[PDB]
């Protein structure tokens, strides 16, 4: 019954695919668990209804008149606006773009939606793992925010280098060389030279998963409840 809305401004669309990944949940889930409205991909109504939460796949583009126009509309329409996938949350690979590729050589600038409009929560990943996306939906559906405390916090996150866990953590002297953050690389750009993480930029999309998954970056004592 709760209405979930997902609008993909400019996204590889992996994020949507990840959503379909949680198969066991999925077949029932659209039907029973959640109501999906105003998804151009998943539905065909052109103008958005008020929606309990809005999921925005991709970083907005300043130049495109429509994307900007749509984003402004979205804030009123969605009681809660959540940006998911790095491309909405951090701007992701988009940042590397320098415009000037035809057609439309002009479109060169893309920014995380978050900068344009306050966003309640963004969960990043390229795409976000299907499970996290399912866990949030059940959480959002089941209305618990102890769980989503980390994400509400993550909405702020925006720019994120691979480079940054080095500035954000290893520099702080926080890093203990556990290796968790390298494992959380979709790109596989990060790897551990003894024993700290060393990453090679040629291959980093700035998704931000490594800053997020370091135990050091923020420790929830929420989980302890989950195991036991």
């Amino acid at each position: 019954k709760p209405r979930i809305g997902y609008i993909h401004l400019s996204g590889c669309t992996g994020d949507a695919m990840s959503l379909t990944e949680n198969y066991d949940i999925l077949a029932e889930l659209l039907t029973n668990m959640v109501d999906i409205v105003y998804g151009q991909t998943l539905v065909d109504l052109w103008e958005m209804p008020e929606m309990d939460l809005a999921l925005v796949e991709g970083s907005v583009c300043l130049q495109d008149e429509h994307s900007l126009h749509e984003l402004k509309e979205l804030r009123e329409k969605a009681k809660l606006v959540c940006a998911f996938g790095s491309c909405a949350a951090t701007g992701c690979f988009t940042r590397y773009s320098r415009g000037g590729q035809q057609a439309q050589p002009s479109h060169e600038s893309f920014v995380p939606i978050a900068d344009l409009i306050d966003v309640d929560l963004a969960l990043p990943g390229c795409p976000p793992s299907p499970e996290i996306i399912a866990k949030t939906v059940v959480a959002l559906l089941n209305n618990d925010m102890d769980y989503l405390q980390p994400m509400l916090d993550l909405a702020g996150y925006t720019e994120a280098c691979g480079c940054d866990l080095q500035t954000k953590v290893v520099n702080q002297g926080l890093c203990i060389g556990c290796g968790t953050c390298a494992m959380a690389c979709q790109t596989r750009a990060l790897d551990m030279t003894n024993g700290r993480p060393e990453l090679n930029s040629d291959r980093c999309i700035k998704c931000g998963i490594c800053y997020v998954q370091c135990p050091r970056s923020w420790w929830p004592e929420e989980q302890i409840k989950k195991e036991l």
Binding site: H8, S10, G11, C12, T13, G14, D15, A16, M17, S18, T20, E21, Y23, L26, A27, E28, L30, T31, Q40, T41, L42, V43, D44, W46, C61, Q63, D64, H66, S67, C92, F93, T94, Y96, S97, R98, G99, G100, Q101, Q102, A103, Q104, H107, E108, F110, C126, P127, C185, Q186, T187, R188, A189, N200, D202, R203, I205
Partner: protein
């Protein structure tokens, strides 16, 4: 007359706006399809950047047909570089592509299912696609690192090669999956006919293009034949030419529709043509893919190296890599000079299609007309990049 604009057209990745000119009966006269998505500009962003990067940035062009994109990019780059994948390494790539075709097609069915399948069935229908979809992913991720967006495929090889324990674990899953996929297509094939869209729907005279049924052959391709021209020339309207975000790639100066329907006619022999035909073609096409999946899998070296070592600094010479994405033919050309790409061009299967799609939506009452477009199952993010 009266022209009706559908924007964005529903149920397809990205956004395209279809513009229609209709007679009083509402039979369409000119159908224009263009992609209004903002260009993420990968082709440009890759340039002057290292070869090692190019596969990673490029695959993000499209998270549905990521594996074909990665494969094409690596092939284009390895070709410009001249690395030779060892046969196990080559086999792993083909095995991943096959799993991907199977998966990608299934995703398409989920999207178009609502028009095709009655609601009573549909929850069951959707579940099956997820079931077929879920197994196929196991192969794509397991061989190629996490997929979607697998990071494992790399210039001149595969990052690592599956253990026999992994290969065995995979096989049972693929072999066991074979009955469900066979049935799933029949139900899909059964459903599509029932709809009985008016016969003669979506018939175009445009030439089809195929290189290979699954893995694409660079050799069967003509730079000489190929050309790309900007929408500004192609489109009727200044407004529409300016609006469109996609270059039209012309084969022999002729707009070309490349598809599973096209891949079948060129290689399988698929005399029938229709929109219903494109749909039928998508089913049998995954049917064929999945086979190769298991075929390559049974005969896999499993200890033969995947990586071939190569020299990154490159001769100026450009190379083309063409592989068949679930939505139609794809090629990547790259020239590597000084170890950083100097020219990068990608033509994605949708790109070929978008010009042919507008002429296709002519004749039959326009309510039908989005049905034709949706049959092509275009993913814009691919078309525009």
């Amino acid at each position: 007359s009266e022209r009706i604009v559908i924007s964005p057209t529903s149920r397809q990745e990205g956004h395209a706006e279809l513009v229609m000119e209709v007679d009083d009966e509402g039979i369409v006269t000119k159908g224009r399809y263009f992609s209004i998505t903002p260009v993420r500009g990968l082709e440009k962003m890759v340039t002057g950047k290292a070869p090692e990067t190019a596969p990673v940035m490029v695959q993000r062009i499209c998270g549905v047909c990521p594996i074909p994109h990665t494969l094409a990019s690596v092939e284009a780059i390895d070709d410009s570089l001249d690395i030779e994948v060892p046969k196990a390494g080559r086999l792993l790539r083909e095995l991943t592509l096959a799993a991907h075709h199977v998966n990608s097609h299934a995703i398409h069915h989920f999207l178009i299912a609502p028009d095709f399948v009655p609601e009573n069935l549909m929850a069951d229908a959707i579940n099956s696609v997820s079931e077929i979809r879920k197994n196929a992913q196991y192969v794509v991720d397991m061989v190629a690192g996490e997929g979607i967006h697998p990071s494992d495929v790399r210039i001149g090889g595969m990052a690592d090669n599956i253990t026999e324990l992994a290969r065995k674990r995979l096989y049972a899953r693929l072999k066991q999956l074979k009955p469900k996929v066979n049935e799933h297509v029949e139900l899909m094939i059964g459903l599509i006919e029932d709809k009985g869209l008016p016969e003669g729907l979506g018939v175009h005279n445009q030439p089809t293009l195929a290189s290979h049924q699954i893995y694409g052959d660079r050799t069967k391709f003509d730079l000489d034949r190929f050309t790309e021209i900007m929408p500004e020339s192609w489109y009727d309207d200044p407004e529409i030419a300016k609006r469109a975000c996609s270059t039209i790639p012309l084969y022999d100066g002729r707009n070309v529709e490349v598809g599973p329907r096209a891949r079948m006619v060129e290689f399988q022999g698929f005399k029938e043509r229709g929109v219903v035909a494109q749909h039928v073609a998508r089913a049998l096409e995954m049917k064929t893919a999945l086979s190769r999946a298991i075929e390559i899998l049974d005969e896999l070296d499993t200890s033969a190296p995947v990586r071939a070592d190569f020299d990154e600094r490159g001769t100026g010479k450009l190379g083309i890599g063409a592989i068949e994405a679930p939505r139609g033919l794809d090629v990547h050309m790259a020239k590597v000079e000084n170890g950083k790409i100097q020219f990068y061009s990608a033509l994605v299967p949708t790109t070929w299609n978008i010009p042919t799609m507008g002429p296709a939506t002519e004749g039959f009452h326009h309510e039908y007309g989005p049905h034709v477009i949706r049959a092509y199952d275009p993913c814009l993010s691919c078309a525009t990049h």
